[PDB]
Write a protein that binds this DNA or RNA. Structure first.
Lengths: 439, 297, 63
DNA sequence: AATCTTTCCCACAGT
DNA sequence: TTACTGTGGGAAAGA
């Protein structure tokens, strides 16, 4: 029993950075089946990012365990390696291996990232959907966990001329990528590094694609993105965005744009470009691994000629992010069923107060912690937990004051957490506040 | 303003082209417990907003005037409201006074509050109508009362921040008024089998339908009301293609499993990843259930 | 008008009862097949390990 | 039927 | 160069 102690928790909650373990998995929301014996690699490719510096500490918590557990009488540098295998609704595929090896050449706050670009589903797999399967563990046969992504649809080929899996939705996430004539090596994906856009060869970014409505801050509506609609592309991580843009259709390097197109919803894996709002001749383009505007030629009134790398394939992508930290030394078991808190609700008054959490993979073995204050958690579904708000008095002390005490509105907002009755914190990232009328 | 359109703030970046001292005494009082003082005029209330952007009634509503100050609240409200008041102003968390009201379940205060031209409808940060909250903390009356404004019944189907409706939230919580709080809504003007359709559109809200939620870790009283009253096709699938049975089977509620089975709910059909009730129950190790399936056909 | 001030606080409670009720019952169930769970994992999660080493032994044999 | 989707079929441009 | 292998376009087969 390695239960969590108020004190230990503080040590964490205080320096999450020097502790926490983030691991995110980006992927496509639709994959193209491969026929017979060919292999049609998923694209973009599902890649896993290892975030935080706790991944280093996580190493040591084992490095000083393989040796400090050896005790008796070159195989060391091996018992600290990151072994990971990603796989699909595998039934006949071995389950591809991601690198993560210490002997890898590089070519911000990202411990290490790997991409699985060999994945593919055969027609022999007669399932309509399927989800990714990732297993992480250490060289020294030490476990970590096992995850699965959101569902992924299987498509025979991208239609030329359900609907939330075949149309892009107003508030969803996508990736925009460019390719060149029957080959791969030249694949670029719209991404954002250090507060700025460009076009990676290495990785791709997930961008929430908003449907502009009207009026920094702006109006966004609900509705499938239709060709010729003002679209706002926001990066999901950083926050950064691109100027207003009018997504538009394109066929064979030609920006097809008559009136009978605003009756066409942007299908998956189709190509298209974003023409500026003012100079309806300019298109968002990249001229060699760096994005810029561009004045492409005019041809008729119902069409337009654009540059090669000015028209890309849009595709809805999703992602998952797992945050976890070992309160007390690695645990015997793994993490695998890792809870993901969606939204936090509250209803009732003072003595009848109640907090509703929503999410996925909720195991009854979890206790919610308002900051450093555990509560009599109630598991209902593995999608929800109710819990009674603890009395303010018993949350922050002369020590926990500056951290739980909102430096702004002098209120008291504490970080919510889901805890494993085995000393492990699963940070919801949400926060409970207490309306305080002092100062 | 509606749920369909929101306000998204975010930075930006442009691509080149070529290379070459206040603490409102009135409020604290109102907040406090008993002490009613200071002028309660048009300038008193209506105009004043702190750091929570809460108006007097907001704090008055906050029946949290603990230490007990019973009936005065209803009155101390009626005051600032009859001395003029934006009976529909929103606080930090987009909560109309009338809401904080249903939150604290001050049905009386509400009653007047509405009469003062207050709109329940106006949902908060949690894209939740007033009726949701009623359901949120299952206060039967509180809703049976509010279900008299024409405009409210209008937003009967509207779904919250987690894409759930009236019953949806009802069926989700158990109790004895519940099964009636339901009979109410259905009587009021709500279809039993509503999946989120008016929303299949963008906003990623969708899937299930009442029965699902009940099914999902028991609430028998309702699954019985729904599959027994009339309707609810136990064979419906959410955006993950799940039959309540499944949901049930997944979570592990043998109790519900059996009823559904008994009523003729298909066990054939599979989810999105070609799985099925057993494989599910089986997958999460709910043998009790597993065997119940093999004990069938 | 002029009706109520609280609201059947004993439904809400009789309820928070039933719920805390299944939470405990369900805390059991999970604590039951708990090892069976960690088992199906303990193994399949290592089935990859010995699958790693032997496919990692190659880097050693060929040198 | 009228059209879309699914399964083939195959040329191109690299290894 | 000959052999082999992704990918994109397009005909043909089904839905």
């Amino acid at each position: 029993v390695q239960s969590l102690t108020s004190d230990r928790m503080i040590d964490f909650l205080s320096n999450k950075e020097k502790y926490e373990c983030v691991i995110s998995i980006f992927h496509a929301k639709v994959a193209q089946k491969s026929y017979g014996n060919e292999k049609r690699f998923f694209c973009p490719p599902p890649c896993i990012y290892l975030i935080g510096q706790g991944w280093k500490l996580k190493k040591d918590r084992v490095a000083q365990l393989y040796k400090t557990l050896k005790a008796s009488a070159i195989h060391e540098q091996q018992a600290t390696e990151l072994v990971a295998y990603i796989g699909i609704g595998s039934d006949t595929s071995e389950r591809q291996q991601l690198d993560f090896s210490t002997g890898k050449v590089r070519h911000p706050n990202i411990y290490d990232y790997c991409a699985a670009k060999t994945l593919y589903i055969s027609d022999s797999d007669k399932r309509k959907y399927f989800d990714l399967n990732a297993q992480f563990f250490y060289g020294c046969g030490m476990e970590i966990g096992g995850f699965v992504s959101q569902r992924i649809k299987v498509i025979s080929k991208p239609s030329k001329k359900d609907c939330k899996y075949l149309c892009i939705a107003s508030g969803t996430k996508v990736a925009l990528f460019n390719r060149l004539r029957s080959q791969t090596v030249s694949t670029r994906y719209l991404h954002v590094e250090g507060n700025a856009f460009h076009a990676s060869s290495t990785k791709w970014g997930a961008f929430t694609i908003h449907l502009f409505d009207d009026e920094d801050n702006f109006a966004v509506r609900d509705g499938f993105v239709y060709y010729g609609s003002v679209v706002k592309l926001v990066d999901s991580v950083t926050g950064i965005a691109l100027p207003r843009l009018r997504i538009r259709k394109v066929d064979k390097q030609q920006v097809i744009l008559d009136a009978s197109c605003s009756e066409e919803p942007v299908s998956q894996l189709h190509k298209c470009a974003f023409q500026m709002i003012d100079n309806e001749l300019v298109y968002l383009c990249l001229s060699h691994d760096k994005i810029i505007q561009h004045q492409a030629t005019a041809i008729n009134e119902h069409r337009h000629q654009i540059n090669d790398g000015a028209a890309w394939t849009i595709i809805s992508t999703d992602k998952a992010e797992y945050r976890f930290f070992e309160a007390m030394g690695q645990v015997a078991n793994p993490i695998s069923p890792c809870p993901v808190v969606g939204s936090l609700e509250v209803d009732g008054h003072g003595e009848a107060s109640r907090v509703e959490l929503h999410g996925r993979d909720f195991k009854p073995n979890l206790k919610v912690w308002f900051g450093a204050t555990p509560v009599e958690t109630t598991f209902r579904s593995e999608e929800s937990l109710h819990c009674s708000i603890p009395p303010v008095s018993q949350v922050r002390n002369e020590q926990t004051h500056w951290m739980f005490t909102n430096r702004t509105t002098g209120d008291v907002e504490v970080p919510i957490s889901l805890v494993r009755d085995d000393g492990v914190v699963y940070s919801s990232g949400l926060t409970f506040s207490y309306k305080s009328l002092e100062r | 303003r509606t749920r369909k359109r929101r306000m998204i703030n975010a930075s930006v970046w442009m691509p080149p082209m070529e290379n070459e001292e206040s603490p409102i005494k009135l409020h604290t009082e109102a907040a406090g417990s008993y002490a009613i003082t200071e002028p309660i005029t048009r300038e008193s209330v209506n105009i004043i907003d702190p750091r929570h952007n809460r108006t007097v009634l907001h704090w008055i509503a906050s029946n949290s005037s603990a230490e007990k100050s019973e009936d005065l609240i209803v009155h101390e409200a009626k005051e600032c409201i009859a001395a003029g008041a934006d009976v529909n102003a929103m606080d930090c968390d987009e909560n109309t006074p009338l809401m904080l009201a249903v939150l604290a379940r001050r049905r009386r205060l509400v009653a007047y509050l509405m009469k003062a031209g207050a709109d329940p409808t106006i949902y908060n940060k949690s894209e939740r109508s007033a009726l949701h909250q009623a359901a949120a903390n299952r206060d039967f009356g509180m809703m049976v009362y509010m279900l008299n404004s024409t405009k409210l019944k209008g937003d009967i189907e509207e779904l919250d921040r987690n894409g759930m409706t009236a019953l949806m939230i009802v069926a989700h919580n158990e109790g004895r008024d519940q099964v009636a709080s339901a009979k109410l809504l259905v009587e009021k003007g709500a279809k039993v089998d509503y999946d989120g359709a008016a929303r299949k559109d963008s906003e990623k809200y969708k899937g299930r339908t009442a029965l699902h939620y009940a099914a999902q870790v028991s609430n028998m009283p309702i699954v019985k009301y729904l599959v027994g009253e009339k309707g609810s096709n136990k064979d419906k699938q959410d955006e993950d293609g799940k039959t309540p049975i499944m949901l049930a089977a997944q979570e592990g509620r043998i109790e519900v499993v059996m009823y559904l089975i008994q009523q003729g709910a298909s066990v054939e059909a599979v989810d999105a990843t070609d799985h099925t009730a057993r494989q599910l129950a089986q997958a999460n190790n709910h043998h009790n259930i597993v065997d119940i399936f093999d004990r069938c056909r | 008008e002029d009706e109520p001030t609280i609201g059947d606080l004993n439904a809400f409670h009789s309820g928070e009862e039933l719920h805390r009720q299944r939470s405990e019952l369900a805390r059991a169930n999970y604590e039951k097949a708990r090892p069976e769970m960690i088992a199906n994992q303990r193994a399949v999660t290592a089935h990859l390990f010995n699958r790693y080493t032997e496919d990692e032994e190659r880097k050693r044999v060929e040198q």
